[PDB]
Design a protein around this motif. Sequence first.
Motif, mmCIF file in Angstrom:
data_model
loop_
_atom_site.group_PDB
_atom_site.id
_atom_site.type_symbol
_atom_site.label_atom_id
_atom_site.label_comp_id
_atom_site.label_asym_id
_atom_site.label_seq_id
_atom_site.Cartn_x
_atom_site.Cartn_y
_atom_site.Cartn_z
ATOM 1 N N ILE B 5 33.973 -0.352 26.538
ATOM 2 C CA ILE B 5 35.114 -1.450 26.166
ATOM 3 C C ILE B 5 36.309 -0.646 25.467
ATOM 4 N N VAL B 6 37.228 -0.641 25.604
ATOM 5 C CA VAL B 6 38.496 -0.001 25.261
ATOM 6 C C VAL B 6 39.442 -0.927 24.518
ATOM 7 N N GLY B 7 39.622 -0.923 23.399
ATOM 8 C CA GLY B 7 40.241 -1.928 22.565
ATOM 9 C C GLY B 7 39.272 -2.660 21.720
ATOM 10 N N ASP B 31 38.005 2.839 20.374
ATOM 11 C CA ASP B 31 39.346 2.622 19.639
ATOM 12 C C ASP B 31 40.069 3.590 18.989
ATOM 13 N N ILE B 32 41.158 3.558 18.787
ATOM 14 C CA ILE B 32 41.808 4.662 17.971
ATOM 15 C C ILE B 32 41.866 4.363 16.440
ATOM 16 N N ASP B 33 41.340 2.946 16.190
ATOM 17 C CA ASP B 33 41.546 2.503 14.685
ATOM 18 C C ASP B 33 40.283 2.664 14.084
ATOM 19 N N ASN B 35 39.222 2.122 11.302
ATOM 20 C CA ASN B 35 38.865 0.951 10.315
ATOM 21 C C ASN B 35 37.937 -0.132 11.156
ATOM 22 N N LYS B 36 38.352 -0.320 12.297
ATOM 23 C CA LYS B 36 37.773 -1.334 13.258
ATOM 24 C C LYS B 36 36.473 -0.567 13.873
ATOM 25 N N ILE B 37 36.432 0.605 14.125
ATOM 26 C CA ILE B 37 35.154 1.312 14.358
ATOM 27 C C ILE B 37 34.169 1.381 13.467
ATOM 28 N N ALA B 80 41.032 -2.959 27.393
ATOM 29 C CA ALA B 80 41.498 -4.358 26.498
ATOM 30 C C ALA B 80 42.596 -3.727 25.539
ATOM 31 N N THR B 81 43.119 -2.771 25.773
ATOM 32 C CA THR B 81 44.319 -2.318 25.017
ATOM 33 C C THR B 81 45.326 -3.251 24.986
ATOM 34 N N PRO B 82 46.479 -3.135 24.029
ATOM 35 C CA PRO B 82 47.566 -3.887 24.194
ATOM 36 C C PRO B 82 48.768 -3.782 24.996
ATOM 37 N N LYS B 116 41.630 -5.602 32.131
ATOM 38 C CA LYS B 116 41.513 -6.909 31.449
ATOM 39 C C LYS B 116 42.807 -7.278 30.787
ATOM 40 N N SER B 117 43.738 -6.259 30.173
ATOM 41 C CA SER B 117 44.775 -6.484 29.658
ATOM 42 C C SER B 117 45.900 -7.000 30.609
ATOM 43 N N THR B 118 46.742 -7.849 30.204
ATOM 44 C CA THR B 118 47.657 -8.434 31.038
ATOM 45 C C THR B 118 48.831 -7.513 31.543
ATOM 46 N N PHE B 142 41.408 -15.044 30.365
ATOM 47 C CA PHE B 142 41.853 -16.237 30.059
ATOM 48 C C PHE B 142 41.612 -17.038 28.633
ATOM 49 N N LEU B 143 40.853 -15.861 27.781
ATOM 50 C CA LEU B 143 40.320 -16.601 26.554
ATOM 51 C C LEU B 143 41.446 -16.684 25.488
ATOM 52 N N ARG B 144 41.133 -17.864 24.743
ATOM 53 C CA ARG B 144 42.001 -18.340 23.595
ATOM 54 C C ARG B 144 41.396 -17.647 22.188
ATOM 55 N N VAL B 196 48.533 -14.963 39.110
ATOM 56 C CA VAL B 196 47.576 -15.709 38.563
ATOM 57 C C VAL B 196 47.879 -15.887 37.001
ATOM 58 N N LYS B 197 47.704 -14.774 36.384
ATOM 59 C CA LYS B 197 47.653 -14.438 35.039
ATOM 60 C C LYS B 197 49.053 -15.143 34.262
ATOM 61 N N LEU B 198 50.119 -14.470 34.702
ATOM 62 C CA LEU B 198 51.615 -14.449 34.027
ATOM 63 C C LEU B 198 51.993 -15.976 34.489
HETATM 64 N N1 NAD Z 1 44.794 -11.878 22.463
HETATM 65 C C1 NAD Z 1 44.602 -12.957 23.560
HETATM 66 O O1 NAD Z 1 44.510 -14.032 23.312
HETATM 67 C C2 NAD Z 1 44.519 -12.436 25.136
HETATM 68 C C3 NAD Z 1 43.966 -13.004 26.118
HETATM 69 C C4 NAD Z 1 44.073 -12.751 27.323
HETATM 70 C C5 NAD Z 1 44.438 -11.407 27.475
HETATM 71 N N2 NAD Z 1 44.992 -10.827 26.529
HETATM 72 C C6 NAD Z 1 45.597 -9.517 26.643
HETATM 73 O O2 NAD Z 1 44.694 -8.201 26.196
HETATM 74 C C7 NAD Z 1 45.256 -7.598 25.565
HETATM 75 C C8 NAD Z 1 44.750 -7.165 24.385
HETATM 76 O O3 NAD Z 1 44.434 -8.369 23.450
HETATM 77 P P1 NAD Z 1 44.026 -8.321 22.034
HETATM 78 O O4 NAD Z 1 44.228 -9.661 21.198
HETATM 79 O O5 NAD Z 1 42.380 -7.801 22.141
HETATM 80 O O6 NAD Z 1 45.104 -7.178 21.436
HETATM 81 P P2 NAD Z 1 44.807 -6.274 19.951
HETATM 82 O O7 NAD Z 1 46.049 -5.561 19.451
HETATM 83 O O8 NAD Z 1 44.071 -7.074 18.919
HETATM 84 O O9 NAD Z 1 43.590 -5.192 20.409
HETATM 85 C C9 NAD Z 1 44.300 -3.841 20.422
HETATM 86 C C10 NAD Z 1 43.016 -2.824 20.071
HETATM 87 O O10 NAD Z 1 43.175 -1.985 21.184
HETATM 88 C C11 NAD Z 1 43.325 -0.458 20.261
HETATM 89 N N3 NAD Z 1 43.983 0.646 21.071
HETATM 90 C C12 NAD Z 1 45.414 0.847 20.926
HETATM 91 N N4 NAD Z 1 45.621 1.944 21.820
HETATM 92 C C13 NAD Z 1 44.472 2.243 22.079
HETATM 93 C C14 NAD Z 1 44.289 3.326 23.037
HETATM 94 N N5 NAD Z 1 45.169 4.389 23.481
HETATM 95 N N6 NAD Z 1 42.909 3.623 23.301
HETATM 96 C C15 NAD Z 1 41.778 2.844 22.584
HETATM 97 N N7 NAD Z 1 42.208 1.699 21.757
HETATM 98 C C16 NAD Z 1 43.551 1.615 21.613
HETATM 99 C C17 NAD Z 1 43.990 -0.929 19.013
HETATM 100 O O11 NAD Z 1 43.651 0.195 18.051
HETATM 101 C C18 NAD Z 1 43.492 -2.307 18.692
HETATM 102 O O12 NAD Z 1 42.280 -2.128 18.024
HETATM 103 C C19 NAD Z 1 46.940 -8.202 25.247
HETATM 104 O O13 NAD Z 1 47.815 -7.397 25.308
HETATM 105 C C20 NAD Z 1 46.906 -9.129 26.105
HETATM 106 O O14 NAD Z 1 47.576 -8.232 27.300
HETATM 107 C C21 NAD Z 1 44.972 -11.081 25.173
#
Ligand code: NAD
Lengths: 387, 390
Positions: B5-7, B31-33, B35-37, B80-82, B116-118, B142-144, B196-198
């Motif tokens: 799981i990436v992110g 993750d790259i952070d 602190n979170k790891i 799951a990156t941003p 999973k990222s949008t 689709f999580l909140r 569907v997502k957007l």
């Molecule tokens: N937050 C929501 O409610 C939600 C719901 C559905 C979909 N999404 C989508 O999921 C994406 C992420 O959502 P989120 O809330 O988890 O964002 P978030 O910013 O909280 O999570 C980002 C994590 O990914 C890490 N990261 C950044 N670059 C990285 C890299 N190159 N390699 C590994 N890790 C890296 C970051 O350090 C950070 O910890 C959103 O941009 C959005 O597209 C979000």
Amino acid sequence: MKIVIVGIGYVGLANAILFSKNNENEVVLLDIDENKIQSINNHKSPIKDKLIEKFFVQSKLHATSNIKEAYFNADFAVIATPTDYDENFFDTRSIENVLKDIKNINSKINVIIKSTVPIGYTKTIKQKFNMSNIVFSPEFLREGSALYDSLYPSRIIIGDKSVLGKTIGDLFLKNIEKKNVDIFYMDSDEAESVKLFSNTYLAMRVGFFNEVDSYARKHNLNSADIIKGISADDRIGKYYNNPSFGYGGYCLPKDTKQLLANFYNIPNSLIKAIVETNEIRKKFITQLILEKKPNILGIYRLIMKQNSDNFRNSVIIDIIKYLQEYNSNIELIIYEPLVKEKKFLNIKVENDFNVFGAKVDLIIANRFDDKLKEIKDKVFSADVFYT
Amino acid sequence: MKIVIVGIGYVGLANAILFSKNNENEVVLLDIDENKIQSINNHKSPIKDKLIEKFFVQNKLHATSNIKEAYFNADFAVIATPTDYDEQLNFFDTRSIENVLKDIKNINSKINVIIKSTVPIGYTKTIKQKFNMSNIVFSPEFLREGSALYDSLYPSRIIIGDKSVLGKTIGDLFLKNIEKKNVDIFYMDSDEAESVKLFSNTYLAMRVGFFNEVDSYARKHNLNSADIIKGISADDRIGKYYNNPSFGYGGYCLPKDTKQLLANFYNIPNSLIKAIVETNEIRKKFITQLILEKKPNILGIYRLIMKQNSDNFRNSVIIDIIKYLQEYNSNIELIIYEPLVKEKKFLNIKVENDFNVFGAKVDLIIANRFDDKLKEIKDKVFSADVFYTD
Ligand SMILES: NC(=O)c1ccc[n+]([C@@H]2O[C@H](COP(=O)([O-])OP(=O)(O)OC[C@H]3O[C@@H](n4cnc5c(N)ncnc54)[C@H](O)[C@@H]3O)[C@@H](O)[C@H]2O)c1
Ligand SMILES: NC(=O)c1ccc[n+]([C@@H]2O[C@H](COP(=O)([O-])OP(=O)(O)OC[C@H]3O[C@@H](n4cnc5c(N)ncnc54)[C@H](O)[C@@H]3O)[C@@H](O)[C@H]2O)c1
Ligand SMILES: O=c1ccn([C@@H]2O[C@H](COP(=O)(O)OP(=O)(O)O[C@H]3O[C@H](CO)[C@@H](O)[C@H](O)[C@H]3O)[C@@H](O)[C@H]2O)c(=O)[nH]1
Ligand SMILES: O=c1ccn([C@@H]2O[C@H](COP(=O)(O)OP(=O)(O)O[C@H]3O[C@H](CO)[C@@H](O)[C@H](O)[C@H]3O)[C@@H](O)[C@H]2O)c(=O)[nH]1
């Protein structure tokens, strides 16, 4: 107890039936259209398409143009006369005609306005007629499920918080079938708002899913897939989401333009786009038909949904006008059994279906039906769920 | 059986727990952070979520920043990156996904990747071609926030943006690990899934946009918003939910997703899409004008978060209101009550986390949502909250 329904359209006739199916009530339908009165008194429904049209064949009911006869000894009057919007013109002259008759004959009849009116209208009209016995209670029924929607209302909105309000409220509860109905009491401007904004929401939702369909068509994606995926979010829902040539009918186009008259001098708004996206969708449908380059085009039905009596402000008539504007060289042919003349809007009507399907290069239909299936292959429609 | 799981964000953490509850899966968060790891490895949820905390309570997962360690022998990678929409250049930002695909391609190009990222409509088709990898499947999330894991275990529906047996593998992988019984699952091509997502998020923004325009109209004419909205929502085609007016829609995702679709709506004179974005900004300026009409001398901001459950205020509409206030009338002294803020100022505004002093200091409090604490001070509180859903 005597109830006068003013106007034998969908709203009045459904309400007339609701109140008459219980022997205690004497119900009188008042109109200016003697064709409508003559139909009713012959136990024929002038509104050719009635779901519960079993009512006429199997509770008595009497229609008249006689102001005197109708309102004489009447406890309630329900105003279900036309209201239009023409440009910014708020056409309520039928309401004022009735209220003027009512104030003349007797003024203490408890008046219920069901016709859709501008926000602030009821409060204004009470002051200007000097009548406090007027209560706005909006109508939410669908055409062609009018009597069903009257017996099983989504909710009852009573635009009056006084004892007159509860009076009107109990009159409807004691006659509807639906039980533990939501009934909300509020001031009159709030009730009028509930109606215009509710219709504007439904227009917006149709406009939304047609923008989805337009987008899918421009990029040659599967509309059904996308809409099915969207609609599985319960906050969005699997209903009222079937793309079309655009929203139309008697009320949504009028009521959205109504509310937009209230929303002027702000830079944009959902309310403005709800109106504008519908015209863009209709012009896009038209452009798509033109690109198929037909020489003779058949319009299948002037109605929009298949459980419909009428084509008053049908979107497919708007499509005809757009086709006529952008390429009058395309010969148009209408298949519409409800039209007895053989030219509607200067367009030939062909009510022999076999001749119609053979005559035309391409058929456009807002919604598919089984009768179209034989010649599915020459049919253009935005219908996705076949509702 | 080994899932990367990436992110470590709201989406990543929810999915990571979704898969590690099942003790036959080996689950690594990457993750790259650091602190979170660190937090994850110390069995510490770096975010707050009811069911997520309970999982950490009950009992698993491991985290790292070493890509060779995470990806070695991985069967699946969930990205799951941003993804951000950045106003400058009017583009959606997908670098994080591309940085991760590059790591995957060099270490184990045959991992089954799940995005999973949008992403923009058309992204996954173009990114499969650009990296020469067909083992990439888009599956929207689709999580909140703050119900992230409940929504993971009990999702409204599953969307798999691939109709091949690889997509069937991805969908079946989610069926196994979710607890929602007999869930709707739709297979479709990748563009349709991205659509569907957007569009789903755009609908939700539209709905909030609608009920705020109702509230705006009602305030302009001194009508009862609660009456009007309850009467509207009693129509079952409209519904008694997701209809509570506010200062505007906000959060990570709705504001960026609507602006992205609007970009992808190339050159349309008007549209619902464009209006959905524009009405939110009008509503925000109208809220600001309303606050200024009350001519407060000292204005208290109650919470920077959107809603009580949230523990973050990225893209919070509260902050936009702050910025409009600072622009329209810089003379009002602003004071922020936000316990999540530990520093003395935020945006150069004094932070007062003693609720006693905060409530006495200010003439008027703005709060996007009422809660328990504010009933005690209700009379100097300005809010558009109609139902007190808290
Ligand atoms: N937050 C929501 O409610 C939600 C719901 C559905 C979909 N999404 C989508 O999921 C994406 C992420 O959502 P989120 O809330 O988890 O964002 P978030 O910013 O909280 O999570 C980002 C994590 O990914 C890490 N990261 C950044 N670059 C990285 C890299 N190159 N390699 C590994 N890790 C890296 C970051 O350090 C950070 O910890 C959103 O941009 C959005 O597209 C979000
Ligand atoms: N069509 C719908 O589904 C619907 C739903 C909810 C509300 N409404 C509202 O109710 C109103 C009426 O709807 P409708 O479609 O049933 O009307 P309609 O056009 O079908 O018929 C209205 C009737 O009122 C008659 N009439 C006109 N002026 C009159 C007068 N001065 N006195 C007595 N009778 C008069 C007309 O002859 C006509 O028969 C709409 O304009 C709209 O304001 C309509
Ligand atoms: O999935 C759908 C549903 C509707 N429409 C179109 O939107 C318009 C409205 O349709 P509908 O709402 O089903 O019937 P109406 O008779 O127009 O009733 C609407 O207008 C009445 C007049 O006020 C209200 O009372 C009703 O509650 C409201 O549903 C019509 O053009 C439909 O063809 C679509 O294109 N796709
Ligand atoms: O009745 C309401 C409901 C919501 N909002 C506001 O709308 C925004 C988003 O609200 P919400 O959807 O409840 O929270 P999110 O965590 O942002 O989740 C959304 O954003 C994610 C997209 O990435 C999706 O996965 C979710 O399905 C979608 O609900 C917030 O600013 C809310 O305050 C209101 O103003 N009134």
